[PDB]
């Protein structure tokens, strides 16, 4: 599970600012 690696996972606060989400 990763903020952007398949499967992406920007459903958190520490994985949202990630240019790969916001």
mmCIF file of C-alpha atoms in Angstrom:
data_model
loop_
_atom_site.group_PDB
_atom_site.id
_atom_site.type_symbol
_atom_site.label_atom_id
_atom_site.label_comp_id
_atom_site.label_asym_id
_atom_site.label_seq_id
_atom_site.Cartn_x
_atom_site.Cartn_y
_atom_site.Cartn_z
ATOM 1 C CA UNK A 1 0.000 0.000 0.000
ATOM 2 C CA UNK A 2 1.381 3.399 -0.972
ATOM 3 C CA UNK A 3 0.101 6.916 -1.419
ATOM 4 C CA UNK A 4 0.687 6.633 -5.167
ATOM 5 C CA UNK A 5 2.155 3.228 -6.050
ATOM 6 C CA UNK A 6 -0.457 0.750 -7.364
ATOM 7 C CA UNK A 7 -2.732 0.446 -5.480
ATOM 8 C CA UNK A 8 -2.502 4.208 -4.893
ATOM 9 C CA UNK A 9 -3.578 5.382 -1.436
ATOM 10 C CA UNK A 10 -4.007 9.114 -0.862
ATOM 11 C CA UNK A 11 -6.783 8.594 1.660
ATOM 12 C CA UNK A 12 -4.598 9.862 4.497
ATOM 13 C CA UNK A 13 -3.064 13.069 5.836
ATOM 14 C CA UNK A 14 0.542 11.876 5.513
ATOM 15 C CA UNK A 15 -0.060 10.770 1.925
ATOM 16 C CA UNK A 16 -2.060 13.728 0.683
ATOM 17 C CA UNK A 17 0.461 16.601 0.507
ATOM 18 C CA UNK A 18 2.431 14.210 -1.603
ATOM 19 C CA UNK A 19 2.592 15.931 -4.955
ATOM 20 C CA UNK A 20 1.339 12.530 -6.106
ATOM 21 C CA UNK A 21 -2.104 13.227 -4.613
ATOM 22 C CA UNK A 22 -3.274 16.770 -3.876
#
